[PDB]
């Protein structure tokens, strides 16, 4: 179906401990495929998925050069942000960026992104029009003015509508074995008595790809949103993900509860019950 490519930059200052560290990771959907760390012994863009190893040396050189220039760029960005926020050079600060494109089943651009953060807060973001900016505050408005004058949005848009979708289409083809395979969750419900009159029903989803999933408990067909313990979807470390949802239920009422599972890998949503 639809697919995404995203690059994630983290630039972290560390006064007294060297120049700011710059890290990039690239994903297609929920699959990491490339990394860069300025603290590496000989920093370069490195493959993290088999299907990207196909790319010739020129790709790796070009990609490495971008990241190496970014290390210097984001060091300047950090220095600039200190001035814009009247901050001292004693503190550690973080700039983040996430950019990329979403394509439809036909590979056409659905939408592009380019968002920046400072110390975990929105700073500036390219609007969906790929022509204009939303600045979060008066400091980011200064960047906005510079970027407007420098036609940054036009360069972003050229990338988002061109290379971003073109390279993502190629990655999807090269990695079709995996990037175009959904793995459905393996599911079950466990039962643990809490006390004589309360029991925990826990609905498990394991081994699924991609990470998007919905797990919900209903009591008598009514969603138990407020009473469900839902953990964050978590990486198993073999590309797949795990999640569970739990409710505490009155003893003897277990059968009034149903677990509902939606996942792209499932032909239809699943209903599970405690199977004593």
């Amino acid at each position: 179906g639809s697919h995404s490519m995203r690059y994630f930059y983290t630039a972290m200052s560390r006064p007294g401990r060297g120049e700011p560290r710059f890290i990039t990771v690239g994903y297609v959907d929920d699959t990491l495929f490339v990394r860069f760390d300025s603290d590496a012994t000989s920093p370069r863009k490195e493959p993290r998925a088999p299907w990207i190893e196909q790319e010739g040396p020129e790709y790796w050189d070009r990609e490495t050069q971008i990241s190496k220039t970014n290390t210097q760029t984001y060091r300047e960005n950090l220095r600039t942000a200190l001035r814009y926020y009247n901050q001292s050079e004693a503190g550690s600060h973080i700039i983040q960026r996430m950019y990329g494109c979403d394509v439809g089943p036909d590979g056409r651009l659905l939408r592009g992104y380019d968002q920046y953060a400072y110390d975990g807060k929105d700073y500036i973001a390219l609007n969906e029009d790929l022509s204009s900016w939303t600045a979060a505050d008066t400091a980011a408005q200064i960047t906005q003015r510079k970027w407007e004058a420098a036609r940054v949005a036009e360069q972003d848009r050229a990338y988002l509508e061109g290379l971003c979708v073109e390279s993502l289409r190629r990655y999807l083809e090269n990695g079709k074995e995996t990037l175009q395979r959904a793995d459905p969750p393996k599911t079950h419900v466990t039962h643990h008595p809490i006390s004589d009159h309360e029991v925990t029903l826990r609905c498990w989803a394991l081994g699924f790809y991609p990470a998007e999933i919905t797990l919900t408990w209903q009591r008598d067909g009514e969603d138990q949103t407020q009473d469900t313990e839902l953990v964050e979807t978590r990486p198993a470390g073999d590309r797949t993900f795990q999640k569970w949802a739990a409710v505490v239920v009155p003893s003897g009422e277990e059968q009034r509860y149903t677990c509902h599972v939606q996942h792209e890998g499932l032909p239809k949503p699943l209903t599970l019950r405690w199977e004593p």
């Binding site: 990609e63 760029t73 600039t80 942000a81 380019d114 960047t143 970027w147 390279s167």
Partner: peptide, 9 residues
């Protein structure tokens, strides 16, 4: 693939 956005803040 990335592209180089070289304009600073």
């Amino acid at each position: 693939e990335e592209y180089l956005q070289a304009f600073t803040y």
